[PDB]
Design a protein around this ligand. Structure first.
Ligand SMILES: Cc1cc(CN2C(=O)CN(c3ccc(C(F)(F)F)cc3)C2=O)cc(C)c1OC(C)(C)C(=O)O
Ligand SMILES: Cc1cc(CN2C(=O)CN(c3ccc(C(F)(F)F)cc3)C2=O)cc(C)c1OC(C)(C)C(=O)O
Ligand SMILES: CCCCCCCCO[C@@H]1O[C@H](CO)[C@@H](O)[C@H](O)[C@H]1O
Ligand SMILES: CCCCCCCCO[C@@H]1O[C@H](CO)[C@@H](O)[C@H](O)[C@H]1O
Lengths: 259, 262
């Protein structure tokens, strides 16, 4: 019961703090209370020329930005994999089930954690060293600016819920341990693990937020929302694959977007 | 000179992760570890005795052949777990993305299994249940087709492989080289896996020079054995496809389903 759920929430939070360089706490402190502002080609060039900062050969500004996004995503996938391994029953699954869960869960988790570094106006990059304006990303030629804006739209609404890192750790864990993923082998184990994570989250939310009896179902709804946000992203990704043939696709992201 | 240390790492991972070594298997198979011997399984009655606590402590089945096939599946799942831990105790394997790790295990475990099987096989049968039992080759031949057809080529491979006289320290490197194969379909970082495999093969060549000084060619014979194992597994998978097609009452463990997919 309780105190089992308290200890579980604490363990999950500790692994989250162990594995994610940027926390919402740190990010909010940067966004208030300074990072190099990237809002046009000139400031981007300054950032790249030592100021803020491995990539495939240069093609153009929009593809360069797309490449930096891919590199960020690969790094966050590595961190999410280490995080999930520290989740108690995750490592008892067969390695292929672990991979299946990561494959279908990382982008939902990435978009959820993105809100931690987003506000109305832009987002932190390079571990908080830079801040890229939403306006600049809107200015990229597109299908490339189309790809990014729905993430802001999701993030500002998600940040209205005012979660903290301790809540998020459980939220991300529940996203990875999802019983619905196609090709999953031990559906009952994964569902039981998720059930424990979500029960811990309901407890943890009570002990944190005024009431939070409405927040929990809203979070469950956000997980559903994350699913099809990723679906839309994948469609955009596929057509970027179809039409932007000079744009190289990182191999891990190719494997993930496969199917 | 570093190759000696690399070999040592890999041997340590092997001794740490495999329940059965060849040293132990040979001592059991030549009556040097017990007053007489492991319990012999050669008919339906001795199989029932063995399962009555004596050797062991399964899905729905209707006949002896399928029962034995289910025991084979259980052994294979356990060995896949052991090979997975062994490969992870190789740091450069663990530096790969998890999906590349799974790809290498998926296409390498059966080659590795068939090689390690030679360690517990002789002319007359094989050790089961971590050496508590010995199931006779003749009993396995008495199973109906296609189950007796699938097992016998493993014996034919094993007898020839044991003629090479490898020890556990050679096998540890051989198995590592089987798993770290740059050829596997869908592999993501082919060059990194190839560099690892090359290091393993250099360590193995060195180790064979040091361990088998009158090695009549032993390293090329082992490379050929790797090709042979690939052909053995191809034929095994064809037989499995025929069992999937024609023995529809016979269930396949989910992990083996995933491995055999495609
Ligand atoms: C999953 C995903 C997330 C995001 C959100 N995001 C990041 O995380 C990092 N970043 C960003 C933007 C501009 C710069 C600068 F160079 F201008 F400074 C540096 C970093 C950004 O916009 C964007 C895309 C396209 C995604 O899609 C890909 C990656 C293809 C995927 O599917 O993995
Ligand atoms: C990979 C493989 C290896 C082998 C070789 N072998 C074992 O390992 C264990 N054993 C055995 C034989 C008889 C008994 C007893 F019941 F009589 F006690 C107990 C164990 C045996 O004969 C056999 C088959 C069909 C294999 O193929 C499957 C499993 C489908 C696969 O592809 O994984
Ligand atoms: C399709 C690929 C099948 C072979 C992948 C090997 C599966 C073994 O994977 C292992 O299984 C254990 C559960 O028994 C887990 O504890 C381990 O973390 C995992 O590495
Ligand atoms: C097919 C979908 C792929 C999603 C899972 C990829 C997870 C990355 O995998 C991780 O990457 C590291 C690479 O440095 C290895 O050290 C880690 O052992 C591994 O867990």
């Amino acid at each position: 019961g309780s105190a089992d759920l308290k200890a579980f929430s604490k363990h999950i939070y500790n692994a989250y703090l162990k594995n994610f360089n940027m926390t919402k706490k740190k990010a909010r402190s940067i966004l208030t209370g300074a990072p190099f502002v990237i809002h046009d080609i000139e400031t981007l060039w300054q950032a790249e020329k030592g100021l803020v900062w491995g990539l495939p050969p240069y093609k153009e500004i929009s593809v360069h930005v797309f490449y930096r996004c891919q590199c960020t995503t690969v790094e966050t996938v590595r961190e999410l994999t280490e995080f999930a391994k520290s989740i108690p029953s995750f490592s008892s699954l067969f390695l292929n089930d672990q991979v299946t869960l990561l494959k279908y869960g990382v982008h939902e988790a990435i978009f959820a954690m993105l809100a931690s570094i987003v506000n109305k106006d832009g987002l932190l990059v390079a571990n908080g060293s830079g801040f890229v304006t939403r306006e600049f990303l809107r200015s990229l030629r597109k299908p490339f600016s189309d790809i990014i804006e729905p993430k802001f739209e999701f993030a500002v609404k998600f940040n209205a819920l005012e979660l903290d890192d301790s809540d998020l750790a459980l939220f991300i864990a529940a996203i990875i341990l999802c019983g619905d993923r196609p090709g999953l082998m031990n559906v009952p184990r994964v569902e039981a693990i998720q059930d424990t994570i979500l029960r811990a989250l309901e407890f943890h939310l009570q002990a944190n937020h005024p009431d939070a009896q409405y927040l929990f179902p809203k979070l469950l709804q956000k997980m559903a929302d994350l699913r099809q946000l990723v679906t839309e992203h994948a469609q955009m990704m596929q057509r970027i694959k179809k039409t932007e043939t000079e744009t190289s696709l990182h191999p891990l992201l190719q494997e993930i977007y496969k199917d």
